[PDB]
Amino acid sequence: VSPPVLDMDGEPLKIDEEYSIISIPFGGGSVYLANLGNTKCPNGVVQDSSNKTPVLFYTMKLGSHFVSENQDVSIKFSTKSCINETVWKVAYSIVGPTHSPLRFVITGGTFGFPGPNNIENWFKIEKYETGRPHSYKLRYCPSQYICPTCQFDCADVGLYENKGYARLALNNKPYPFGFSKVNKN
Ligand SMILES: [Cl-]
Ligand SMILES: [Cl-]
Numbered sequence: 413v414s415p416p417v418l419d420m421d422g423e424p425l426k427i428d429e430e431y432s433i434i435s436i437p438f439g440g441g442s443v444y445l446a447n448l449g450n451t452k453c454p455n456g457v458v459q460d461s462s463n464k465t466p467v468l469f470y471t472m473k474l475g476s477h478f479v480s481e482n483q484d485v486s487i488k489f490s491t492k493s494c495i496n497e498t499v500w501k502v503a504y505s506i507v508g509p510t511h512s513p514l515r516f517v518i519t520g521g522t523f524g525f526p527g528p529n530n531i532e533n534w535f536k537i538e539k540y541e542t543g544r545p546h547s548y549k550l551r552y553c554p555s556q557y558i559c560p561t562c563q564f565d566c567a568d569v570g571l572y573e574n575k576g577y578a579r580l581a582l583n584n585k586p587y588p589f590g591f592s593k594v595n596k597n
């Protein structure tokens with residue numbers, strides 16, 4: 413049984429509530445939404461190395477209010493033409509001097525219930541030891557049932573400098589984050 417992901421106050425991460433994703437504990441800033449190449453709507457999921465755009469987590473699972481470790485979760489940046497351009501997903505690009513494929517985290521997912529049609533939407537949060545409480549890593553490894561014929565190339569989420577930004581990327585080099593609740597009530 414997997415316990416809930418906890419925010420930096422030690423409180424379980426609740427679905428559909430705003431949290432900022434913060435680089436901890438060794439420096440760096442927040443995750444935010446950036447425009448990478450004068451596109452109509454910004455689609456870059458980036459880290460401010462040293463800007464903040466909170467996120468909302470969704471599992472659409474009756475009986476589970478919280479995001480648990482290793483639970484499939486869909487992620488949106490919080491907020492007029494760009495209202496449907498906030499849903500996180502993963503997508504291949506070709507990068508670097510070796511022109512090698514790398515999957516970046518970007519917006520432009522179509523929010524939905526999990527299935528073969530939207531494999532790109534699904535993330536996991538795992539505990540990641542740093543010596544500081546409440547540090548985690550993001551990960552791409554969707555539950556097999558979401559696409560039974562998929563053989564996923566699972567990878568932890570890290571950062572890769574590209575297009576002038578520290579971009580969230582499936583480079584399998586975990587970058588530790590914590591979750592800071594925006595509205596404590
Ligand atoms: Cl939900
Ligand atoms: Cl419920």
Ligand SMILES: [Cl-]
Nearest residue numbers: 502503504505
């Ligand atoms: Cl792709």
